[PDB]
Amino acid sequence: DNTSPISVILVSSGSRGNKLLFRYPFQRSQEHPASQTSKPRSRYAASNTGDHADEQDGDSRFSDVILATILATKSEMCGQKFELKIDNVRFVGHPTLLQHALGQIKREAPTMILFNVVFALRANADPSVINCLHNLSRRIATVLQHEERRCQYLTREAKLILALQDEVSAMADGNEGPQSPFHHILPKCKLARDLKEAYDSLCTSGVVRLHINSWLEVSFCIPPEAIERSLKAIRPYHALLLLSDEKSLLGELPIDCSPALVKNLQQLAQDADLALLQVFQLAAHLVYWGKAYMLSPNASVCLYSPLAEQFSHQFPSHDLPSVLAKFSLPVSLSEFRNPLAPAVQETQLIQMVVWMLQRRLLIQLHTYVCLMASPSEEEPRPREDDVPFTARVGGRSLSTPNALSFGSPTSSDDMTLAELLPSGDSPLNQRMTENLLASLSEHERAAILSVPAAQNPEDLRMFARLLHYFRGRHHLEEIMYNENTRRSQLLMLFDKFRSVLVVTTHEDPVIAVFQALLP
Amino acid sequence: EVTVVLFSRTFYDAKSVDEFPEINRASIRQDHKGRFYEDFYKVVVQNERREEWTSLLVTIKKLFIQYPVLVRLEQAEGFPQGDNSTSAQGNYLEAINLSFNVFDKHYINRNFDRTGQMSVVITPGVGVFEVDRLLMILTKQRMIDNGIGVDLVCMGEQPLHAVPLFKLHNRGDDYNIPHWINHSFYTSKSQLFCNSFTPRIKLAGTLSAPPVVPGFCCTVGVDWKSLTT
Amino acid sequence: SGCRIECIFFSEFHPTLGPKITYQVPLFDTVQVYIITKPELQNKLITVTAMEKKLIGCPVCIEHKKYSRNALLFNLGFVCDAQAKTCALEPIVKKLAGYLTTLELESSFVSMEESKQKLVPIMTILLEELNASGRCTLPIDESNTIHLKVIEQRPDPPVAQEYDVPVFTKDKEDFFNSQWDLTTQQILPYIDGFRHIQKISAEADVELNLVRIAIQNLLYYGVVTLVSILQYSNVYCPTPKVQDLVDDKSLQEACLSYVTKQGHKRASLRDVFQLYCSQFGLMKNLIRRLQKYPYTGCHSYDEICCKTGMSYHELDERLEN
């Protein structure tokens, strides 16, 4: 559904001085398909001096599409347009105009038209896709001082659209200190989903606009110690090298972006898992309770009155910062924020005291998958001796049809079967034991390349599918799949499932499983 | 050689000045339910061949606009309820039986210019009909003789069961499925995403051997070849 | 009142002494807009819908061409806001073009000019009554009463897998039980009986593909699916509660606010929120009833709705666990 009806540059609107189309066949400086040839200007066309058209999919009358496009893509007044024709064809149109003869805002002749570059889509578009096409057109259609219909960039663009689904990204991603989610979310979208622009603008702590392409490059013809301070544990050095590449160069990024890149191999496994499929976890608090020593005034102030009008005044008013002041004001600011990261921010000794005091008083606690660190963002919150880890999204292998000796059902502690100190909950080490041992050196990360499809099933089973298929209640399936790893007789007792896959009873395989149990 | 006959029912048209042998009265044995109703037939062109059609389409538009007063405010005026639902009542089986009442006397006045026999009922129904037992058994025994009946549904929306079906109306809800009838749907001409198969309306406020639901049914066409030749 | 139309226009390519006449009802079909949208209002391709964007708004239009000797060509256009939905206003304009076609082929409106003036109060009543309620019954003949309805055009529904659970967000007692399909009337009684594969052979005895299609259409209109309701946790019970245990996780799961495998921590770590925002269980016995089978009101929905009047706890609960 990410298809490609047409990307076209028709010479529909040549209104200028000399040395092109005007009343002859189609002809321009450095490009003349002429003398009455097939005349191609559209998407899938073999392109050199000579050229060949192809017509593949637009779900309409294609010569009518061309002859209506000629007169239905030109605009007289500038700007960018959009045309939704019938239910399943759209045109996100992008003209621009630069009409001047020898003004050049030296060449052989002014051959400058109303520009006519446009790509299409059918019937289920996305404003992100629309913004992508706007930005690509703005970067394509600039000046080209000597006019050059370089169609090699057209061929790279036509391969760019179908080839790579994602727009632009980076394998090297930065960090979430105290500032990066706010610096993301205050405009939320500066220019065209650019991770590199995002981390660089936060990296020098200032906004600078050097252009970013999608996959084909189009040119327009300081180090602070706080970075390595907030990025000690995860990626300081090549990120500082990317700072050097962005304070020095532009467009010369894929030379230094990617090629700069028990416990140790599990650290690399944590990196290769944080690249795609495992999230981390934190906790927060809140001051909300009540109904009809230093806890009862706070409770009264929260109950019969609003809070910040009262409890923010007494703690300087008695000339003592103490337990109730530390419980009142910084914990209230942390309740304004609600990660534990500002408690990491504004401290020098509070980190061993804060949850102690929250257990001391009647503040309500909860634990959660952390705030909005979505996979359209880089990587948050570096690993330490304390951060807990759990994977959710990424799929894995299969147990019951293929009848592996390795049991992998996704149940509670999701994948049922000095040593991972940052493992907070059981899914992390259960998933990596279901991946592989810690013995292979480079074949281990070859197997991490292999776990896409995970030795090639797709798991349509989530431990309640067995209760769907047959009379496997909770007790029986846990008693069998908690020693499934050892001997496959208990496996084959269910994995003779071909016999109740050829049921010939046309109503119910549950009764036939129950009958085929003991024999 | 065509007829185009419109037919419908109304409820509570009990009596007026000498409109008595026109009404009928429907009832149910197992739960008592008895109402007055009345059947209307309005014919358009009766027995006439002509080329260059589509003028009947203009006359059927005229009769569609004239129809609700034409059926409501006639012979008896109690409180009228017009044009009852097909999935609740209907004069369908009686209409096919009256077409058979025409076709039994084919030997009376014999045209030398016609061979085949055809009766097509266009309904906006869903496929459900609530039908008396005796009329259904009687029309089985009468289509034993000369099979001529074809049903097509311009409602569309092919439901999630064996679509020609009869709930019995005898003097579990007793189902029946016919295998003598030739049903065909008419999908309209447009292209969208997921054609829903359900309606919804918000109120203000020993054997049981045929059920109709375990029978599988993908799509039914129009079968133009059994409607043109 | 989501979509908001504002101007409706007819136009016609006049014989040569006039370019193109327009019949407007109130935006305004001004000079520069009609100049730059001139090329769409005459096309090779006819009888297709086409809408364009411009600085002020959006013409959704269709043109038609009839009476090929001194070839006549008209168009109906429907100009609305720049960024509204306007996906519910394509078939209405196309259907009006079809009605105008049959009106010209039966009685020839646009060859006599008093009917051309009569064509304008048609637009005024349409501009009132579309924004009034969204449907129009409008007689203009002894043989044509145009009928129009705004279809909401809801998005696609997801898949209905074989092991989920339906829940009515709405209430069954607000519809006509007599107005359903037969399959919906044979499913809808045991729809609170949670498991889908239970309810099919409990009451339905249908094809499982058929009950899948039926619950998918009820998901397309008014029924929300969720995952199964085996008692995962057991140890949430040592807090004191006032009879608020079963519907709790069903509601907050219907709010789509969890990672799925609830374990033993989800229920207590939000049950403190349920306790401050306000015989036996026979808990070993809901297990054999789970394969295929041949204060007065308990406060479970009232408290979440009366705090859904506020938004802090639904922030703290959309932020899931």
Distance from C-alpha of B156 to C-alpha of B196, rounded to nearest angstrom: 11
DSSP state of C125: H
Helices in chain B by DSSP H: which ranges?
A: 55-72, 92-103, 133-143, 225-228
**Contact pairs from chain B to chain C, CB under 8 Å:** 77
Helix axes A443-450, A263-274, angle to 10 degrees: 30
DSSP state of A50: S
Distance from C-alpha of C211 to C-alpha of C217, rounded to nearest angstrom: 10
Q: Which of B190, B198, B202 sits opposite C184 (nearest CB)?
A: B198
Distance from C-alpha of B74 to C-alpha of B63, rounded to nearest angstrom: 15
Which residues, in sequence order, are CB contacts of C277 under 8 Å at separation 6+? Answer: A288, C303, C307, C313
Residue of B nearest to C218 (CA): B198
Edge-first strand order for the sheet with C20-25 is A7-9, A117-121, A90-94, A83-84, C50-52, C57-66, C72-81, C5-13, C20-25
Nearest residue to A115 (alpha-carbon basis) of A90, A138, A94, A92: A94
Q: Which of A82, A86, A467 sits opposite C290 (nearest CB)?
A: A467
Edge-first strand order for the sheet with A279-286 is A364-369, A279-286, A389-390
The number of CA neighbours under 13 Å toward the Cβ of B12 is 5
Q: Is C280 exposed, middle or buried (0-12, 13-18, 19+ CB in 10 A)?
A: exposed
3-state secondary structure C10-61: EEEECCCCCCEEEEEECCCCCHHHHHHCCCCCCCCCCCCCEEECCCCEEEEE
C-beta neighbour count of C136 within 10 angstroms: 19
Is C69 annotated as belonging to a binding site?
yes
CB A291 within 8 A of CB A362: no
DSSP state of A308: T
Cα-based torsion angle of the residue sequence C8, C12, C18, C22 in order, rounded to the nearest 10 degrees: -10
Distance from C-alpha of B121 to C-alpha of A339, rounded to nearest angstrom: 70
Distance from C-alpha of A247 to C-alpha of A242, rounded to nearest angstrom: 8
Q: For chain C, list the contacting chains (3+ Cβ pairs, <8 Å).
A: A, B
CB C25 within 8 A of CB C108: no
* Residue A39 φ then ψ, to 5°: 60, 70
Distance from C-alpha of A358 to C-alpha of B192, rounded to nearest angstrom: 57
Resolution (A): 4.0
Nearest residue to C49 (alpha-carbon basis) of C93, C101, C100: C93
Across the interface, do A291 and C276 touch by the CB < 8 Å criterion?
Answer: yes
For chain A, the distance separating the N- and C-terminal CA atoms, rounded to the nearest angstrom, is 50
Distance from C-alpha of B119 to C-alpha of B100, rounded to nearest angstrom: 9
Which residues, in sequence order, are CB contacts of A111 under 8 Å at separation 6+? Answer: A16, A17, A18, A19, A20, A28, A29, A147
Cα-based torsion angle of the residue sequence A234, A238, A244, A250 in order, rounded to the nearest 10 degrees: -110
For an interface test with B, the pick among A1, A87, A506 (most B C-beta atoms closer than 10 Å) comes out as A87
Which residues, in sequence order, are CB contacts of A248 under 8 Å at separation 6+? Answer: none
Residue B15 Cα to chain centre, angstroms: 26
Distance from C-alpha of A425 to C-alpha of A388, rounded to nearest angstrom: 7
Q: Is C220 exposed, middle or buried (0-12, 13-18, 19+ CB in 10 A)?
A: middle
C-beta neighbour count of B199 within 10 angstroms: 16
Q: How, if at all, do strands C50-52 and A51-53 pair? A: unpaired
DSSP state of C201: I
Give, in order, the Cα–Cα distances in Å from A433 to each of A221, A269, A320, A479, C274.
54, 12, 54, 20, 38
Residue B155 Ramachandran class (φ > 0 left, ψ -120 to 50 alpha, else beta) = alpha
Across the interface, do B203 and C176 touch by the CB < 8 Å criterion?
Answer: yes
- At B6 the three-state DSSP class reads strand
For an interface test with A, the pick among C49, C229, C291 (most A C-beta atoms closer than 10 Å) comes out as C291
Interface check for A474 against chain C (CB to CB < 8 A): the answer is yes
User: Which secondary structure element, helix H or strand E, spans residue C166, and what is its range?
Assistant: strand C165-168
CB B151 within 8 A of CB B164: yes
Which residues, in sequence order, are CB contacts of B110 under 8 Å at separation 6+? Answer: none
Partners of C201 on chain A (C-beta within 8 Å) are 507-508
Interface check for B196 against chain A (CB to CB < 8 A): the answer is no
Q: Which two tokens stand for residue B6?
A: 């419109």
Helix axes A427-435, A263-274, angle to 10 degrees: 100
Q: How, if at all, do strands B149-153 and B119-123 pair? A: parallel
- Cβ within 8 Å of A, C 51-110: 51-55, 90
CB A406 within 8 A of CB A431: no
Interface check for B208 against chain A (CB to CB < 8 A): the answer is no
Distance from C-alpha of A484 to C-alpha of A400, rounded to nearest angstrom: 11
Residue of C nearest to B172 (CA): C186
